[PDB]
Scaffold this active site. Structure first.
Site, PDB file in Angstrom:
ATOM      1  N   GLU A 130      -4.676  14.151 -14.693  1.00 30.87           N
ATOM      2  CA  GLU A 130      -5.371  15.620 -14.373  1.00 30.87           C
ATOM      3  C   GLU A 130      -6.599  16.179 -15.700  1.00 30.87           C
ATOM      4  OE1 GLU A 130      -2.495  14.961 -14.651  1.00 30.87           O
ATOM      5  OE2 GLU A 130      -1.600  16.943 -16.105  1.00 30.87           O
ATOM      6  N   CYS A 170      -1.168  11.370 -14.276  1.00 28.38           N
ATOM      7  CA  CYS A 170      -1.602  12.129 -12.850  1.00 28.38           C
ATOM      8  C   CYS A 170      -3.137  12.095 -13.176  1.00 28.38           C
ATOM      9  CB  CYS A 170      -0.279  13.397 -13.492  1.00 28.38           C
ATOM     10  SG  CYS A 170       1.181  12.455 -13.517  1.00 28.38           S
ATOM     11  N   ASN A 217      -5.014  10.112 -18.276  1.00 24.80           N
ATOM     12  CA  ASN A 217      -3.583  10.574 -18.109  1.00 24.80           C
ATOM     13  C   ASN A 217      -2.653   9.336 -16.957  1.00 24.80           C
ATOM     14  OD1 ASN A 217      -3.852  12.395 -16.182  1.00 24.80           O
ATOM     15  ND2 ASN A 217      -1.510  13.391 -17.084  1.00 24.80           N
TER      16      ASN A 217
END
Ligand SMILES: Cc1ccc(F)c([C@@H](C)[C@H](NS(=O)(=O)c2ccc(Cl)c3c2OCCN3C)c2n[nH]c(=O)o2)c1C
Ligand SMILES: Cc1cn([C@H]2C[C@H](O)[C@@H](COP(=O)(O)OP(=O)(O)OP(=O)(O)O)O2)c(=O)[nH]c1=O
Ligand SMILES: [Mg+2]
Length: 665
Positions: A354, A352, A350
């Protein structure tokens, strides 16, 4: 500094009502003044529930707990998190918190009040979108979405575009796998022309991120595998120098990197650039199956260009040196160590970095996030309450799982995906703050043990809740065939044996009878807004400074770290001179001659802490993390060898995300 927060909390209390249900009525009854259009700001269904239960609900709120916000935490609450009627705040923090809890739990008033308490006391938090829109009409409660490009065609490309546009509008962050789109110069059969490639289509995505920006511009992270022929161009387009048509600087950039490429770089072999049209299917396989397929095209000479793998490598490092990016993800570990490998190869993370979740043309992955405040579970005997931590973790899991069911989805592909595999992502903040509270320096052997126990606990607590839900509700649809169904758990895929703190034999036996409700559970995310609110240090991550400074309307703040300050005041060594001393040390004690070498160790900054030990800690907790972690890397004075040194260590450690942003001084 601490006082101005008290004042601003009190003024607010002075300028809002005190009855929670009456605030809810005002938001619901709201009328567009220009229009007369009844424009309800909470959903009617929420309000009914509130009014049907107003005595318990109104009564349960404790307005003392508004005073737990520090100044800028509060200001941020007031700027974006408290509903306004015609530019005036109506909502108290406690009010929004109650709104969120009734919004999640609905008619289960007990469940709601437990959540309010837990939230209001700051044991944990839900992510911003869910604070923004819970208890609201058609509420979009999810933070992130992931997408695989639909088709290698104009119909496909603009369909995905519309999805990214609709997801942006509804406040979703996006991660997108673009590796199937055919390279610059490749042939087009139906028109008998050639593709303009990645750059010009990404230019359209870039303008879409600018255009659909509801207050920061839309955030799309683009995922490229390095075997794709446009890679060198793809690294250029973040840079602040160069031709406008060659750039897309509002986008974000990530590499979905195979093991094979890293092995070629270190052995100093040749790297073969390909076109996904010419050599299809590479993103739909991983590890050895990929490598066989990659080698196959290579032996056939379906290869548009060849380069020194070490040439690509240098191209990547200068990008990170200049830009801070691309993000480094290792597709093989992500795939190898995934409870979803069940469903096929996973093509991206995604925004970010994570979240590691499957996507396909029928499936847009989603994830609902919340975060536990780790500082919270330190007892006053400097003991860490693993039992409590798992107590709260179990609530969060259930809440997040409730969210899946009541979320309004911007596109139908995301609804399908989320109710098919029911992933969630629980993370953390104040990991640093916990250490200080336990009097452990970050690099100490005690911290390194704690680190593992904390994440063993959360993963234990999480599975245990998920397991109970499969008891009540049943497994998720694609549970059968998963690693967890086969009795394999996340630490098993890293070949780790847990500390003896928790009994996994019990759990692995609970899971064997009932199964679990959620395909995935754990994912430390950045927490930039939510940690500032709660006054905790960001997610994982060493303390950045002993001093936080901010120019405001009425001059400046110079807030010394609260943990440090209480300690110098105690060990009666605190002075106002020390404040200006620190600023010269750019956040650092270490130089101040007047301070205990025991304290100096404890409050060492991020710029003064071993990035290898950071990586080693990510890897150790990583074995208890279903998904991945948004791990930044701080290197004050980067050079070619340092970054190379760092990346390979991350990779060899088996990290799914090797680096998120590169931070420097
Ligand atoms: C193996 C490794 C992993 C990650 C990583 F970031 C690095 C260096 C680039 C990285 N270089 S560095 O940050 O400029 C650096 C370089 C040299 C030292 Cl002695 C230190 C240091 O970081 C802060 C304090 N320390 C111990 C580093 N972290 N830990 C370490 O021993 O070196 C290496 C060598
Ligand atoms: C028509 C067109 C396609 N493309 C790109 C988009 C895709 O990467 C790729 C294929 O586009 P398509 O829309 O699939 O073109 P096509 O169906 O006519 O050709 P084929 O039979 O080969 O599928 O070419 C351009 O870059 N510019 C254009 O003007
Ligand atoms: Mg076509």
């Amino acid at each position: 500094a601490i006082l101005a927060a008290r004042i601003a909390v009190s003024n607010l209390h002075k300028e809002t009502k005190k009855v929670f249900s009456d605030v809810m009525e005002d938001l619901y009854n709201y009328i567009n003044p220009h229009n007369g259009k009844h424009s309800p700001m909470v959903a009617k269904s929420t309000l009914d529930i509130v009014l049907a239960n107003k005595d318990r609900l109104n009564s349960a709120i404790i307005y003392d707990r508004d005073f737990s916000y520090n100044y800028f935490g509060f200001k941020t609450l007031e700027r974006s998190y408290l509903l306004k009627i015609n530019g005036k705040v109506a909502e108290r923090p406690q009010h929004m918190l109650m709104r969120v809890s009734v919004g999640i739990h609905k008619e289960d008033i007990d469940a709601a009040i437990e959540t309010y308490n837990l939230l209001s006391e700051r044991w944990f938090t839900h992510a911003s979108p869910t604070l923004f829109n819970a208890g609201t009409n058609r509420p979009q409660l999810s933070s992130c979405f992931l997408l695989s490009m639909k088709d290698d065609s104009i119909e496909g490309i603009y369909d995905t575009l519309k999805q990214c546009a609709l997801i942006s509008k509804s406040a979703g962050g996006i991660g997108v796998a673009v590796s199937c789109i055919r390279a610059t110069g490749s042939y087009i059969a139906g028109t008998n022309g050639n593709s303009n490639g990645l750059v010009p289509m990404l230019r359209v995505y870039n303008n879409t991120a600018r255009y659909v920006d509801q207050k920061r511009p839309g955030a799309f992270a683009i995922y490229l595998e390095p075997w794709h022929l446009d890679i060198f161009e793809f690294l250029d387009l973040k840079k602040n120098t160069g031709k406008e048509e060659q750039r897309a600087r509002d986008l974000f950039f990530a590499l979905w990197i195979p093991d094979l490429f890293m092995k070629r770089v270190e052995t100093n072999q040749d790297w073969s650039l390909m076109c996904p049209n010419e050599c299809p299917g590479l993103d739909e396989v991983w590890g050895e199956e990929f490598e066989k397929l990659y080698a196959s095209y290579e032996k056939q000479g379906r290869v548009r260009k060849v380069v020194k793998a070490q040439q690509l490598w240098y191209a990547i490092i200068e990008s990170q040196t200049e830009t801070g990016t691309p993000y480094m993800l290792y597709k093989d570990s992500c795939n190898r160590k995934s409870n979803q490998q069940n469903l096929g190869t996973i093509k991206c993370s995604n925004l970010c970095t994570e979240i590691v979740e499957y996507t396909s043309k029928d499936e847009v992955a989603v994830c609902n996030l919340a975060s536990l405040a780790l500082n919270m579970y330190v007892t006053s005997e400097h003991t860490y309450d693993f039992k409590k931590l798992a107590e709260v973790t179990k609530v969060v899991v259930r809440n997040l799982n409730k969210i899946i069911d009541i979320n309004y989805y911007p596109v139908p592909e995301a609804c399908l995906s989320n109710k098919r595999h029911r992933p969630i992502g629980i993370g953390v903040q104040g990991l640093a703050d916990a250490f200080i509270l336990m009097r452990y320096p970050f690099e100490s052997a005690e911290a390194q043990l704690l680190n593992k126990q904390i994440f063993e606990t959360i993963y234990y607590g999480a599975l245990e809740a998920s397991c109970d839900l499969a008891k009540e509700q049943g497994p998720y649809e694609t549970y059968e065939g998963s690693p967890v169904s086969k009795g394999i758990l996340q630490y098993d895929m890293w070949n780790v044996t847990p500390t003896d703190l928790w009994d996994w034999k019990v759990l692995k036996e609970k899971i064997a009878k009932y199964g679990i409700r959620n395909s995935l559970l754990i994912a430390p995310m950045p927490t930039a807004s939510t940690a500032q609110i709660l006054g905790n240090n960001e997610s994982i991550e060493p303390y950045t400074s002993n001093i936080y400074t901010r120019r405001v309307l009425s001059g400046e703040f110079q807030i010394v770290n609260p943990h440090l300050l209480k300690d110098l005041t105690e060990r009666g060594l605190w002075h106002e001179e020390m404040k200006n001393q620190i600023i010269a040390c750019n956040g650092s004690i270490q130089s101040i001659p007047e301070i205990p070498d025991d304290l100096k160790q404890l409050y060492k900054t991020v710029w003064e802490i071993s990035q290898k030990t950071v990586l080693k800690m990510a890897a150790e907790r990583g074995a208890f993390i279903d998904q991945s972690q948004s791990l930044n890397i701080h290197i004050a004075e980067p050079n070619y060898g340092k970054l190379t040194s760092m990346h390979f260590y991350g990779w060899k450690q088996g990290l799914k995300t090797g680096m998120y942003y590169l931070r420097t001084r």
